[PDB]
């Protein structure tokens, strides 16, 4: 939990003032004021969809979800009126498949990539039991998401350092990219779903292009192959004074 | 930033609860 | 400083019975004509053969059961089967209508 | 003599045996129940040209890929090939419900059948297709279910034995798959 | 070029011999084989200004020194070249799927390419760092067939072992 | 997302040309025979937890090796999941029959389809089984040539439909092999 | 993830088994000497931190190039993240210790950590000395054959719990490698 | 799976900890109450052909409209795929047994088993029914002991709730 | 409520956007189908006491052991909640002729359905065996209009695929 790259070589995350402005009894928050009000919708329109580069007629129908967002400050209540929309079906679910679309919740809501899947076959276990609104509501009313988040910042991608699994910190790599990469590039096709249901990892150079400035990105790689055989048993031996003991 | 002792729909409950 | 072709020949033997290709099978005939003494089973080994004639009454048949089957010629689609070689010669009284299909029509009885 | 009735497959060529009338009244009274399952391996073999004619061909009833060019039945001798290892599936099993057991099934006629299909390119999934019509002309055999001919038997209840036939058609099927 | 045909042609003209059966059964291999390598080709044909664009970013991430001043990839100049330098690698093995041997990066690509490489200071390690994840970054359905990616990371595994 | 009338517009587009009489004939005709392609869509949606719950246990009786421990669809939870995606095969060619389109059917339900089947580790010889068994049921209802359930249609001919089902039941089948 | 108890039903639901008498005299063993396992594994809780401090300085000590400009230990920043790496792998081998199985060392811990590796740009030959002194750190306090820190036992062998969790850190090299 | 050591080892992965003292106290118990369930899981292992036979006739005497044409038990297989599936649930009881959980029922036996269950036209009832007679049958001092019991049954009725 | 008019309004909504003249012409044919559902609506509701007393009494036609004493339809005060619980469907069918939708049926009627019948252990298969009976008890030119029996028998087994 001590995160080495998180708030030494990114930024800081964005977000409300504080949360004791909801216990206020003369105010809602702290009111920010529309110079500071829009430069945080910004940074909301830049992750849930991506850089998708929404223009000013598509814009105009999320009108009603700002001009709530600007009297109830809940950025939650945001995100989640952001992700019923037309403007998210139409680049992530419309064209894709489905775990396409799984894997681009994970990461415009959570910050992070799917751990397994357990835990990717219950979203669809939610798809059943109605429809793409019940995948969205449970992310968003999770415990995850209030111990991370809350109603007060934007979802960002966190280094945390102490990853339940060390294969989520890799498909958070996959997933989020440089600056320059939004997320219609391939033709649906989720990335993720190879190394999902069979269990391997990444590749190491689509990694390393997500990583920020200032980490080695790339270096390590040895000239032979990039992932380990799962058959190999090696003879690893230890010196004591007389031999060599292999304690396998 | 989060600061554990928070909600955030309950919230909008108890406001149309204690004027109920 | 191994033999390849005798190491697996021997290894590919033992395995593998020598019992499968040769079609052998028990041919079981009950005689029973209703007398206690005339009931004999008789547990005999037959080389048993691939009747060439019987398949052309099944082949056929079902080649134009399914020649009449208005939902199985979709969903059983046929690959797209290539004619012999004969070499066109440029009159098309031979070439579209050859002698071993000339005056053949289907007759429905 | 049914130790000797091993012995006439074990060699790898013909050897003809038999019991007598007494033999068979021996073997009747050792065994349990044995009037029936003679009954039971004369009700297929008396109609076993028919059970391999209507299941090859059932076959190609629900799957005309087979007899379409580009298939495995076609060309005038893979058809013929495969009405003879239809017979050969049938007296295997016919075999093994006279002498009661799968041991003479499992071993010389299902061992090595999986390899070889798929040496030869023989879909295996169809040849469990054509076990399971014979295992379903066999238990209306077995039963005198059988609705375009009925045959005349003693009266009684033969559901044990048409279990025992057709749990040996699932061992044709569980080595293919 | 080293390939099946010229193997077995060259090794009956230095004999002084006819094409026998043995010559003949080994283009038989050419043609049970011409399926998997060619789909192997046109999907490398077709896609290959977004390959060596993935692979020549993993020689600059590893060896992220060469953008110093001093070093091989110094300038804007220098850094197309590498670009255009791997483009080569890739449209040679382009080649040798077609071909079918091990020719055309045999005498266009492998040739006097250490001498070259060694006199203008350029490191064959990062050569070598844009080939070795092109061949680990290879999903065997999803890119191409399953024999298709066995010849395709053999000829990357060809010139791995020649550059080393 | 395209359907019937909209790959007509977007082919038109790509020539900078207005849609002109000559290519309206084709659209003309579809919503001529409009009504009896809706008449023979919900012959499929109301018997649609029966074809699955066929489809499925038919792929069973032909390959039984689906059901031994190590199966594919050997416990439970596998079982369920073979149900599961048997219903989805089922939904999405009920919408390109809907749209007169195979857009939608491939790039959400098939995009990707073959990669996953293989890392899941799920047959590809017996998965296509299972949509050409529902294959052959769906041109059933619309030639109403079913054995059990008739149902009371209006007479001519839907051997168009009947014809276009099965071009899109086997574009699944060319997705998975 | 599983233990020691779980490995061997899904041994047995390959061959769709019951886990009887002969399978059960390996479980009645890891009972019987479950008190010690317990006993063990305190032993290395008691004195993880002193435990990774030491390995991760001792591998510094015998590459002084972690150290300088441009070693992957060289900051604090990068120092705290080797010190945290070095308590995560030691944390998931007491898990592995405790269950008698390394199920979840391999997959939580140790799969895809090769590639996070060649990625940030730890040195794989140098980590794996990190893991390789606390493997001879585990084995000293579980005989109690350590030069300071002897604890109180009750008298008997370790012997093979010392080489198991020999063999749950050689794990961890093999899968960085 | 779902045990007393998969417990105490992911509530501790989550908060990051080592294996603290009161982990170490939960498995004293999976030691101590081990000879109870290790007994009733060899009993059942050694005897499971004829509780099973018991188990599916009691199904059938209290449902015989099953056999009634066009039912689940129909013909002679689909009785035979009656004595399999409930074979299949005594194999699971001794899983739960050794394992000392239950996780080998609700994940290979109870999940997904409503959904096909549903489809297949198979009723629970005829299920519970089979599993409710088995936990009648257990007697104390003869089949087991008196804590092999205790152990054994409620395993059985846990399998109950799961179905009703 | 899901019908015509709803899901015509609540995907502009959900777009943001005034409707257009697409799904104006969405409810052109919700005027067309108005003559034939409505047709069928008081053809149920002024015959639904026949109905159900001739499809409530086949499924104890068909399933006489829940008349057994310790089962489901064990005395007259279960009989007659039974005929009460199969009138619903048959006034919620009578709901989906009038919205032209599926929604009373979808949320009054199956939302939640799976859980308390398998918890009161009340047979899913006897609800389904009385809706296919009025779903073959229907005569078309003698009960209503020719489109009006294909309404009908829409929403029956929509039921039927809902139910099981
Ligand atoms: C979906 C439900 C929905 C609605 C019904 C409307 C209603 C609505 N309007 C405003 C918000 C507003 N509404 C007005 C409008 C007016 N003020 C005037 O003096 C004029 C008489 C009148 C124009 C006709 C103005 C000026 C604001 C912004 C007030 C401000 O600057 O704080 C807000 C607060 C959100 C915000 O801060 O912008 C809401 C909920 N918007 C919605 O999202
Ligand atoms: C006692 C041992 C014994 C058997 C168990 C059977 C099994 C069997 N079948 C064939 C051989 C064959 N078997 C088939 C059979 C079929 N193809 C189909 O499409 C159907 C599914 C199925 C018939 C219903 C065919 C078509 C061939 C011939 C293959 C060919 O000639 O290319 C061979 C030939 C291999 C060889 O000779 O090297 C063998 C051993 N025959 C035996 O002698
Ligand atoms: C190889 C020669 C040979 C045979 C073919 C059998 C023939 C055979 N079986 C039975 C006698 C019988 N056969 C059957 C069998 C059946 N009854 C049914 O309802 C089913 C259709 C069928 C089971 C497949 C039964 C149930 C009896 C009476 C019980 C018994 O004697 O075992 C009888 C005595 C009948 C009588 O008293 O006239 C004879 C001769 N035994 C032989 O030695
Ligand atoms: C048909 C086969 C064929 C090839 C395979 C290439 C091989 C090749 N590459 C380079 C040339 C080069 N290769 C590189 C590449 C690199 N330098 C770096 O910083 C990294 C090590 C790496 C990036 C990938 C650079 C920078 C040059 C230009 C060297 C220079 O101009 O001094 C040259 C020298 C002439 C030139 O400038 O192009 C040749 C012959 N050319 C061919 O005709
Ligand atoms: C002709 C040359 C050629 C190659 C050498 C490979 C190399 C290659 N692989 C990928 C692309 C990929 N390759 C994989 C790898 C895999 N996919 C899986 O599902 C498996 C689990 C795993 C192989 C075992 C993945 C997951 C991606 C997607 C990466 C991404 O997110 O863009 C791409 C990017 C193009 C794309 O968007 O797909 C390229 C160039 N492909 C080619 O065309
Ligand atoms: C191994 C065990 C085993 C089975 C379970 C069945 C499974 C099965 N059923 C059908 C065949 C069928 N399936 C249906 C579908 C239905 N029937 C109805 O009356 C309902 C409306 C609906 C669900 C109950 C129909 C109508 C047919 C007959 C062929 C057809 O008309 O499509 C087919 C073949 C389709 C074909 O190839 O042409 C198969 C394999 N067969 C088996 O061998
Ligand atoms: C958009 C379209 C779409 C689909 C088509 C399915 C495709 C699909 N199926 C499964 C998952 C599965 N799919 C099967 C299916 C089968 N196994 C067999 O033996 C049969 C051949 C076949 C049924 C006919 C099984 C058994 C699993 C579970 C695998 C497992 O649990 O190990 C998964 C993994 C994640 C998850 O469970 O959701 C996916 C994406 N899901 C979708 O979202
Ligand atoms: C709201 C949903 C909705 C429906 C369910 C249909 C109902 C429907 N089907 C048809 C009408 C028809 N339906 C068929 C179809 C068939 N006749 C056969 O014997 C074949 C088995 C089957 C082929 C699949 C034909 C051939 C017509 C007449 C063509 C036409 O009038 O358009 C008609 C026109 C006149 C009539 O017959 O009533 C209507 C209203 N329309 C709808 O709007
Ligand atoms: C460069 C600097 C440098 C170091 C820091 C040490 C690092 C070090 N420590 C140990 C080895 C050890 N380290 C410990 C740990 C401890 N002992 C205790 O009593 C404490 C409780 C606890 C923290 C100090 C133990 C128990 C051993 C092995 C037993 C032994 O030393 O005999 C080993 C031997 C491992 C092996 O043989 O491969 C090494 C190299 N050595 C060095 O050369
Ligand atoms: C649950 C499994 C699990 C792990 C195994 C670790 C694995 C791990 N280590 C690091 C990250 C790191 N790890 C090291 C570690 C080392 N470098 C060295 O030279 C030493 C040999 C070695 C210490 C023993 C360093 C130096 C970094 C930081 C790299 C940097 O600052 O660029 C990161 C990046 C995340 C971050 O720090 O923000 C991850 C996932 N974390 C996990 O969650
Ligand atoms: C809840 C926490 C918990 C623990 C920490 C352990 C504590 C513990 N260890 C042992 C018991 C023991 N511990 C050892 C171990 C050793 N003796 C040696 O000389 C070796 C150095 C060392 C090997 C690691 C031996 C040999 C026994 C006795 C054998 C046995 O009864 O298992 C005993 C049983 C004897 C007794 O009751 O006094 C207990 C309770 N058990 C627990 O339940
Ligand atoms: C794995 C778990 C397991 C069980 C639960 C039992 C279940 C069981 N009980 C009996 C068989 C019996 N069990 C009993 C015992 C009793 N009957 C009563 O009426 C009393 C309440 C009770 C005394 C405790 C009796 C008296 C018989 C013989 C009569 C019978 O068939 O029930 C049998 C028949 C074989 C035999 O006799 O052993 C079986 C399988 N056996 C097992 O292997
Ligand atoms: C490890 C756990 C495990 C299980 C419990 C079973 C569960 C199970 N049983 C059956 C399958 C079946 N199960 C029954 C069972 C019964 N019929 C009745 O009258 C009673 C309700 C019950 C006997 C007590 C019948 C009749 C079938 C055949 C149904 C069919 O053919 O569709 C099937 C369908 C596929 C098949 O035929 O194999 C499955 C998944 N499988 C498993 O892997
Ligand atoms: C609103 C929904 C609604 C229904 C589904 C039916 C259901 C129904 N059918 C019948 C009763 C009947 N219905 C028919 C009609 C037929 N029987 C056949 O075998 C022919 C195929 C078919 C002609 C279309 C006949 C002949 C009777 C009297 C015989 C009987 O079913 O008892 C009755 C008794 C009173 C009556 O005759 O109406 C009822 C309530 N009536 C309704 O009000």
């Given at each position: 939990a001590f995160s080495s790259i998180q708030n030494v070589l990114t930024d800081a995350p964005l977000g409300?003032?504080?949360?004791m402005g909801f216990l206020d009894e003369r105010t809602e928050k702290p009111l920010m004021g529309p110079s500071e009000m829009d430069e945080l919708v910004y940074a909301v329109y830049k992750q849930v969809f991506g850089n998708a580069h929404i223009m000013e007629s598509e814009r105009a129908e999320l009108r009603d979800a700002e001009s709530l967002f600007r009297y109830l400050r809940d950025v939650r209540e945001f995100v989640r009126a952001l992700a019923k929309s037309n403007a998210y079906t139409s680049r992530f679910l419309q064209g894709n498949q489905q775990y396409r679309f799984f894997e681009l919740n994970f990461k415009h809501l959570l910050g992070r990539g799917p751990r397994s899947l357990e835990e990717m076959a219950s979203h669809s276990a939610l798809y059943a039991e109605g429809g793409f609104e019940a995948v969205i509501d449970a992310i968003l009313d999770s415990d995850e998401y209030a111990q991370e988040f809350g109603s007060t910042v934007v979802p960002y991608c966190r280094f945390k350092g102490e990853y339940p699994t060390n294969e989520e910190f890799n498909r958070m790599l996959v997933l989020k990219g440089a600056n320059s990469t939004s997320d219609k590039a391939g033709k649906g096709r989720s990335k993720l779903c190879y190394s999902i249901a069979a269990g391997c990892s990444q590749n190491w150079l689509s990694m390393s292009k997500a990583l920020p400035f200032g980490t080695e990105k790339g270096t390590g790689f040895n000239l032979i192959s990039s992932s380990r055989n799962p058959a190999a048993r090696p003879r690893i031996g230890t010196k004591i004074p007389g031999g060599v003991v292999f304690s396998s | 930033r989060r600061t554990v002792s928070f909600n955030a729909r309950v919230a909008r409950n108890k406001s149309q609860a204690k004027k109920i | 400083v191994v033999l390849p072709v005798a190491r697996a020949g021997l290894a590919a033997t033992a395995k593998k019975?020598?019992?499968?290709?040769?079609s052998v099978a028990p041919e079981i005939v009950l005689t029973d004509k209703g007398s206690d003494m005339s009931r004999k089973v008789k547990t005999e080994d037959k080389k048993v053969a691939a009747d060439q004639a019987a398949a052309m009454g099944i082949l056929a048949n079902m080649s134009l059961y399914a020649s009449l089957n208005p939902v199985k010629r979709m969903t059983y689609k046929a690959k797209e089967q290539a004619p012999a070689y004969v070499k066109k010669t440029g009159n098309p009284v031979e070439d579209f209508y050859p002698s071993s299909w000339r005056n053949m029509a289907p007759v429905i009885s | 003599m049914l130790d000797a009735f091993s012995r006439v497959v074990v060699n790898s060529d013909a050897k003809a045996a038999y019991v007598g009338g007494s033999d068979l009244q021996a073997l009747k009274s050792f065994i349990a129940d044995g009037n029936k399952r003679l009954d039971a391996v004369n009700s297929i073999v008396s109609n076993a040209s028919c059970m391999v004619s209507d299941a090859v061909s059932g076959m190609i009833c629900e799957n005309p890929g087979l007899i379409s060019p580009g298939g495995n039945c076609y060309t005038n001798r893979r058809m013929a090939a495969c009405l003879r290892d239809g017979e050969i599936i049938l007296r295997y099993v016919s075999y093994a419900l006279l002498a009661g057991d799968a041991s003479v099934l499992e071993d010389r006629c299902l061992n090595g059948l999986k390899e070889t299909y798929i040496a030869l390119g023989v879909p295996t999934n169809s040849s469990i297709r054509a076990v399971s019509i014979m295992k379903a002309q066999a238990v209306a055999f077995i039963t005198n279910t059988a609705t375009e001919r009925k045959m005349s038997f003693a009266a009684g209840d033969c559901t044990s034995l048409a279990s025992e036939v057709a749990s040996y058609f699932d061992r044709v099927g569980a080595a293919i798959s | 070029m080293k390939s099946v045909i010229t193997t077995v042609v060259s090794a009956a003209d230095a004999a002084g011999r006819f094409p026998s059966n043995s010559d003949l059964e080994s283009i038989q291999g050419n043609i049970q084989r011409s399926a998997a390598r060619l789909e192997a080709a046109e999907k490398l044909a077709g896609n290959h200004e977004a390959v060596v664009k993935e692979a020549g970013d993993a020689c600059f991430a590893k060896y992220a020194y060469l953008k110093n001043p001093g070093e091989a990839g110094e300038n804007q100049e220098k850094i197309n070249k590498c670009y255009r330098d791997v483009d080569h690698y890739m449209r040679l093995v382009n080649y040798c799927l077609v071909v079918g041997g091990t020719g055309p990066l045999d005498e266009?690509?492998?040739?006097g390419a250490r001498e070259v490489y060694r006199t203008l200071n350029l490191p064959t390690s990062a050569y070598v760092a844009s080939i070795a994840y092109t061949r680990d970054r290879l999903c065997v359905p999803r890119d191409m067939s399953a024999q298709a990616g066995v010849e395709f990371s053999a000829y990357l595994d060809y010139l791995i072992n020649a550059l080393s």
């Open positions: 409300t003032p504080s949360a | - | 019975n020598q019992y499968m290709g040769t | - | 266009w690509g492998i040739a």
